[PDB]
Amino acid sequence: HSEREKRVSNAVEFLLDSRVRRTPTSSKVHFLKSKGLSAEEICEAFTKVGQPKTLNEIKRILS
Numbered sequence: 784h785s786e787r788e789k790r791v792s793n794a795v796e797f798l799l800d801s802r803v804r805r806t807p808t809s810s811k812v813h814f815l816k817s818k819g820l821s822a823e824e825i826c827e828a829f830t831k832v833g834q835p836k837t838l839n840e841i842k843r844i845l846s
């Protein structure tokens with residue numbers, strides 16, 4: 784796996800956690816950026832767990 788794939792895979796496992804699911808999107812997005820994910824990678828992770836967010840929303844949170 785590439786380092787990008789590891790970042791996204793780790794983000795997926797994070798977002799699936801039951802306590803994490805109850806945490807607001809904003810906090811999760813900030814946390815995922817702090818682990819080195821780009822806005823596009825964050826967006827990909829949310830879509831892969833069936834919790835899709837627009838890239839615009841993710842960028843708004845991080846701006």
Ligand SMILES: COc1ccc(CN2CCc3c(c(C(=O)NCc4cccc5ccccc45)nn3CCN)C2)c2ccccc12
Pocket residue numbers: 789790791793794796797800802803806810811814815818819
């Ligand atoms: C921002 O909110 C939270 C952050 C961390 C936690 C603590 N962990 C929850 C579960 C969890 C964490 C992590 C975690 O920190 N994984 C590492 C990780 C996660 C995401 C991206 C990563 C990118 C590169 C390297 C590691 C990365 N993974 N999982 C899923 C079970 N293993 C963090 C929170 C717990 C409950 C509610 C909110 C949490």
Ligand SMILES: [Cl-]
Pocket residue numbers: 809810
């Ligand atoms: Cl915030």
